[PDB]
Amino acid sequence: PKPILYYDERSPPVRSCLMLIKLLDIDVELRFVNLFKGEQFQKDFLALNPQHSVPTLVHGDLVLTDSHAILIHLAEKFDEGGSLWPQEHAERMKVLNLLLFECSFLFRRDSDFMSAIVRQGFANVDVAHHERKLTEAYIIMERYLENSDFMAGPQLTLADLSIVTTLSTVNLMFPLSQFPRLRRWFTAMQQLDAYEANCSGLEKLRQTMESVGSFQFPSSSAVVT
């Protein structure tokens, strides 16, 4: 049976899976779970994923509840022997290490910021606090890109797919003017045909966040090429 992806394209980790699905031309059934309406708490989805989170993948008997596991699973089954999830051990561990950076550091801090907007309203958020936290993530990614051309090495990997969706979401708010390597990398990612799968959900996220938070992202921040 072909994979089933429970999704809300506003979510960066969902969009990372959408990019991989487009990149590898995987046939996947899409099942929308509207996070704005709380559909992740629907009884059947909750029993499927007690974390009530998207993306969730059902592929046969396998149920994955984290984008980073979904990316690895889909790469092993549809990019077998390929370079997105590289064959050599050290290269693969480097990709895994950056996937975990996305979970542990980048997405955690972006989610922290957007959760404060939803709960308090943008005018009541300590924006300077979150600017510091997320600029710190910019600094770290700039350092990674000072030593390699893509995030995890000389070529595109799963790490770039995971990170670029959250980047583009952070960059709705915070400009990349002071980060030339990260701007060059982001521009290169935007030229990829697979990046088309990030565009619609990023814009839907912008619309929803501006509505719920009663604010506007500064239009000048987002890198657009």
Add this chain to the structure above:
Amino acid sequence: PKPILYYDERSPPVRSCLMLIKLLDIDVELRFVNLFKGEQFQKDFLALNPQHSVPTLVHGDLVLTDSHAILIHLAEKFDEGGSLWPQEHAERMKVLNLLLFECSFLFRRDSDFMSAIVRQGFANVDVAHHERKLTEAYIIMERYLENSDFMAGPQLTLADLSIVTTLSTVNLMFPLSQFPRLRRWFTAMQQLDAYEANCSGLEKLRQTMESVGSFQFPS
């Protein structure tokens, strides 16, 4: 070159790596980075790990900056053919999924709570809020244990090592009496020879958090 582990054993993700090292009898060189003194911001360590986090593993030219990658790396290098990191794809994906649950959900919420204590002081923390968030993690793990003796199946895996160190840290504040599968599992984990690697740092974390937070854990 033998692996080098930069560590502060107060940290649950550090303790998971220490448990695996004891389980597999891995010869490592330990290097203490005192987080209480801010030594993770020392110039050479930031150069090595710009996330200024422990655990950090240096193994030859490979530098790993996340406990979950370190667990997988060490299992693949030192436990080929073991059950901790299963060879079968579906089983391996299940372990990976639970390792990411630990990063994304359990440790995130435990770190949220302990960071509130450090920044605000225990007397000013919304304990009820964090009790709800962490009890939600208990509920999820209790469901994970419905069909299996361990988190990822019938056998001990890397997922149990990652989860149990954070468990025991959450359990310093919130008891497990309402979660029979989870309490059974934790008692069984505590009986492992390798669980001794968790003991020292858990107590050091209790002592340090109680001083920095100016409080005492109920346990």
